[PDB]
């Protein structure tokens, strides 16, 4: 049972079509990342999964139903970007307000206040909250009830990397239960260990969708092999130039090789066999570099 089946929508405002022929299929437990610019390519495709807009030349099937049914929205969390809650209300009363609207039990408010790390700042006003403190409150209303779809629009903005890794540990706890979620983020290093399949989309279209092993296989992107003092930089800079790979001439005792990842099975055998591996880092082309390629593939 696929959660979000965006089936050939084409959303337009006037004469301009801000989203053309988008065809998504989010699975039952996948963590998808809607990556793109902050303009109307992504932020209207985020609204069709919600009940906010309507597909002008297609249809969306959120949880096998229409996206504006009340049975859908009781099991649909949504953390929006740049949210600022009611500042004269308190942190516990804001969740007690949002639990009554979603039909969640009131015994889940103090559970989720402890779960997101807001136990110390409960019963304090939202005006005396930080930016990352309100993101913990905005995450906590998305987990209200038993949601089966989350649209976390930029969840780790203004969050510390302890709390950011606490958030992605809550993501991998959620998707094991069967809650397939959607990332709409911009901090692209970091998310790639938890994104099940990226959904990098341009101004109008959907550029590429699929897993990280499928984006690296289709888009030919070079591997970032870094070393530090194997034998000598100048004795190793010459070797990749006859074999057809880029060897970057770094400062001293460091060999950065931008190789084409097709011959690198046996290329690493000679790299291990003649020197010590004491500081190396072979990096696959990241989601920051994949998004940089697909923006130049269209635009």
């Amino acid at each position: 049972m696929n959660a979000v089946e965006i089936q050939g929508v084409s959303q337009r405002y006037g004469s301009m079509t801000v989203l053309h022929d988008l065809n998504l299929n989010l699975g039952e437990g996948e963590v998808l990342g809607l990556f793109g610019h902050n303009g109307a390519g992504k932020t209207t495709s985020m609204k069709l999964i919600l009940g906010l807009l309507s597909p002008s030349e297609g249809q969306v099937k959120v949880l096998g139903r229409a996206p504006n049914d009340p049975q859908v929205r009781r099991q649909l969390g949504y953390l929006p970007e740049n949210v600022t809650f009611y500042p004269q209300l308190s942190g516990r009363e804001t969740l007690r307000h949002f639990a009554r609207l979603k039909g969640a039990a009131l015994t889940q408010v103090d559970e989720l206040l402890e779960q997101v790390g807001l136990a110390h700042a409960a019963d304090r006003r939202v005006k005396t909250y930080s930016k990352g403190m309100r993101q913990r409150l905005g995450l906590a209303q998305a987990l209200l009830g038993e949601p089966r779809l989350l649209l976390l629009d930029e969840p780790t903005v203004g969050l510390d990397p302890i709390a950011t890794q606490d958030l992605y540990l809550l993501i991998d706890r959620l998707r094991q239960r069967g809650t397939s979620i959607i990332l709409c983020s911009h901090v692209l290093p970091g998310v790639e260990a938890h994104i099940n399949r990226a959904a990098i989309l341009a101004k109008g279209c959907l550029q590429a969708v699929g897993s990280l092993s499928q984006l690296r296989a289709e888009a030919g992107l070079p591997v970032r092999i870094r070393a530090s003092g194997i034998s000598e930089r100048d004795s190793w800079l010459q070797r990749w130039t006859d074999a057809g790979h880029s060897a970057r001439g770094l400062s001293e005792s460091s060999i950065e090789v931008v190789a084409v990842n097709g011959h690198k099975l046996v290329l690493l055998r000679q790299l291990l066999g003649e020197g010590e591996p004491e500081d190396i880092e072979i990096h696959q082309p990241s989601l920051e570099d994949l998004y940089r390629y697909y923006m130049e593939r269209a635009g």
């Binding site: 919600l50 009940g51 906010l52 009340p70 929205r73 009781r74 649909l76 949504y78 929006p80 970007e81 740049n82 949210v83 600022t84 809650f85 009611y86 004269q88 209300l89 009363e93 307000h97 949002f98 009554r100 609207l101 979603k102 039909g103 209303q141």
Partner: protein, 248 residues
């Protein structure tokens, strides 16, 4: 019902508004200070209390609800609330219930201490006439406040920023209190050959501040038409606010 679950928010968020509690205290102080100079110094002082609540109960209603729709849009919670199991009708009508019971309490602190300052400083006030002339006063001041509450929902849904909502809430307060009657007087003293002055007792029905005073000053119409015309100013402007809120 989710019309009450969002109404308990606006009670809890509206009663902690520092701007409202300053004016609602100033409304209750000036309602005692008018009743102090109307008893120690009853239709002459209940008319001066009507001029106070024509100044401030539109101002109390527009201070509560100028940022009801667009204040949630700027805060981002309006986009969040529509993804909840909530219609756009239940957000607006639930805000009208929540902000409505605030100024249904602000006249009980406003006129609850003004009717206390009359019933305890005349010593022979004949209180059977007091609890019917003030019972008609507290009810009709809420209905005046519920018009300007619904007027504030019209201007909140139309604008896109919170700063221009207060520029229209000041404009609605100026036009409906002291610009419409100044151009009624200017239609008298500057135009006399083509302005029938018998039409002017009927032209007060196009102004909810004017219908508020006419059921505290008792006229070609009876009293019951003005009560059904004050409630029609609520029901039209709430229906106008719901039609604007469905086009965001």
């Amino acid at each position: 019902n989710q019309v009450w679950n969002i109404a308990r928010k606006e009670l809890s968020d509206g009663l902690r508004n520092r701007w409202l509690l300053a004016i609602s205290l100033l409304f209750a102080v000036l309602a005692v200070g008018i009743a102090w100079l109307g008893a120690a110094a009853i239709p002459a002082t209940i008319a001066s209390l009507a001029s106070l609540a024509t100044f401030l109960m539109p101002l109390i209603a527009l201070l509560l609800a100028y940022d009801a729709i667009v204040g949630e849009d700027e805060g981002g919670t309006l986009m969040l609330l529509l993804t909840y199991p909530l219609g756009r009708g239940q957000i607006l009508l639930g805000k009208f219930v929540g902000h409505g019971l605030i100024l249904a309490l602000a006249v009980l602190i406003g006129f609850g201490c003004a009717a206390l300052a009359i019933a305890l400083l005349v010593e022979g006030v004949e209180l059977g006439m007091l609890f019917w002339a003030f019972g008609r006063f507290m009810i009709s001041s809420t209905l005046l406040g519920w018009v300007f509450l619904a007027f504030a929902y019209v201007l909140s849904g139309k604008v896109n920023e919170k700063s221009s909502a207060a520029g229209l809430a000041l404009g609605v307060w100026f036009l409906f209190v002291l610009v419409f009657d100044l151009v009624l007087l200017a239609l008298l003293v500057l135009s006399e050959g083509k302005f029938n002055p018998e039409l002017l007792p009927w032209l007060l029905l196009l102004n909810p501040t004017d219908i508020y005073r006419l059921i505290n000053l008792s006229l070609p119409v009876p009293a019951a038409v003005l009560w059904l015309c004050l409630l029609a100013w609520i029901g039209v402007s709430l229906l106008l606010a719901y039609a604007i809120f469905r086009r965001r």
